[PDB]
Amino acid sequence: SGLVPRGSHMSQERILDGEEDEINHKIFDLKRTLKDNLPLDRDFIDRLKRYFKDPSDQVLALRELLNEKDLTAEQVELLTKIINEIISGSEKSVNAGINSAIQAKLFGNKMKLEPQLLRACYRGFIMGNISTTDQYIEWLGNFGFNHRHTIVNFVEQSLIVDMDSEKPSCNAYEFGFVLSKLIAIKMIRTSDVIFMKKLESSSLLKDGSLSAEQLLLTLLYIFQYPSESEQILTSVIEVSRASHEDSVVYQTYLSSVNESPHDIFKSESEREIAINILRELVTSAYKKELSR
């Protein structure tokens, strides 16, 4: 570890369902039903699950209830065993939701987004089985154009914290796969940024006829389906022709692909296909334009 005394008190502050007062009552009702007077734990579970549907929140509520200074005695055992039932087979998802709660609140307030949506986001990222491009397309769709870069920062900050937690969502090897996933995502952001600068110098976005988001998606599809670059660019061409010569828009894509991280494509072979097609497009356009 091996010297950080993790941790760890403060469970209630990591609960993302409701309001500080709305959560505070809920925890008291569970303190009132009842560790102080000596009930009775069956269907008390359905009360727990009714107040907090999310397992991360459910676990945090019981950990707070485990703070009561009674501290008798078999009640500890019953509280800790309900914790095991909720967590069992869901360790990853629970631990990720807990470990990223403060970041979700931090970024939630910054992005003007609901924290629990960011919690779902980080869980989805470490537990999903979708590609880097699909993941990027999903975030773009879910959170918006404005939030596309910030969302990857939130995941990175959540990952950092998760790895430093006393109970991380993954083991070393699994975080290794997550780290690789994240760097690949960051490469996509890098081309996203490169691509945006190329559209600026081309001014293909100034008038507002073309949307930066749809243009981005077009570039993302090229990373996925290089052989269909020509078809992918069809709807762009139908609009750009009004003020831009075909070769300008094709060059914008060629150069963006040229100077972007190679690893965004499935392989170098697939990257060559994209470059060869876009060059063929640029070349054909120029010859048609100057002659005549």
Residue numbers in the entry: 64 to 355
Study authors write:
Blockage of effector secretion before host cell contact is mediated, in part, by a protein that has been proposed to act as either a physical impediment to the entrance to the secretion apparatus, or as a gatekeeper that determines substrate hierarchy. Across bacterial species, this protein (known as MxiC in Shigella sp.) possesses only weak sequence homology and in some species exists as two separate polypeptide chains (e.g., in Yersinia sp. the homologue consists of YopN and TyeA). MxiC is an elongated rod-shaped molecule with a long axis of 86 Å.
In order to improve the quality of MxiC crystals, a shortened construct encompassing residues 74–355 (MxiCNΔ73) was expressed, purified and subjected to crystallization trials. Reductive methylation of MxiCNΔ73 yielded crystals that diffracted to higher resolution: 2.85 Å and 2.5 Å in space groups P212121 and P222, respectively. The first and last domains consist only of the X-bundle motif while the central domain also possesses a bent helix (α5) that is packed against domain 1. It is the first two domains of MxiC that are equivalent to YopN while the third domain of MxiC, equivalent to TyeA, is connected to domain 2 via a ten-residue linker. There are a total of seven independent MxiC molecules in the crystallographic asymmetric units of the three refined crystal forms. These structures reveal that, although the fold of each domain is maintained in all structures (rmsd over Cα atoms of domains 1, 2 and 3 are 0.5 Å, 0.9 Å and 0.8 Å, respectively), there is some flexibility at the interfaces between domains resulting in a “wobble” of the terminal domains about the central domain (rmsd over all Cα atoms of 1.4 Å). This region is buried by crystal contacts in all seven independent molecules of MxiC in the P212121, P222 and P43212 crystal forms, suggesting that this region may be a “hot spot” for protein–protein interactions. Surprisingly, the most striking difference instead involves the long á-helix (α9) in the central domain of MxiC, which is straight in all of our MxiC structures, but possesses a sharp kink in YopN when complexed with TyeA. It is the straightening of this helix that results in a reorientation of the C-terminal domain of MxiC, compared with TyeA, and opens one face of the molecule.
